[PDB]
Structure 1
Amino acid sequence: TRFASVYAWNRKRISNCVADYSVLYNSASFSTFKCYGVCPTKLNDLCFT
């Protein structure tokens, strides 16, 4: 419901969970979706620390 300001941006840590990026990538709600060092279509079968 509420977002942070740009000067005091908010860091949320995501961990110990199973992600699903197909719900984000295949959504039409986003005007910008730019990935660096990783391809959005491959992001759905990788693991991160």
Structure 2
Amino acid sequence: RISNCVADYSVLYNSASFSTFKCYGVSPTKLNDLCFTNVYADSFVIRGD
């Protein structure tokens, strides 16, 4: 649970490593203006399929 900081959501979108980038929540470029109340970052690794 990341909180009380500033996030570089523009450049995060910029690294071309991201191959499956599905932003069902909101449009990617618009991650910059809105203020997120809180946030979780659930990380793991799964199959390619």
Q: What is the TM-score with the length of structure 2 in the denominator?
A: 0.65
Gaps of 5+ in 1: 1-12
Gaps of 5+ in 2: 38-49
Identity %: 97
How many Å apart are 1:25 and its aligned residue? Answer: 0.8
CA RMSD of aligned residues (A): 1.0
Q: Which runs of 4+ in 1 moved over 4 A?
A: none
Higher strand share: 2
Q: What is the TM-score with the length of structure 1 in the denominator?
A: 0.65
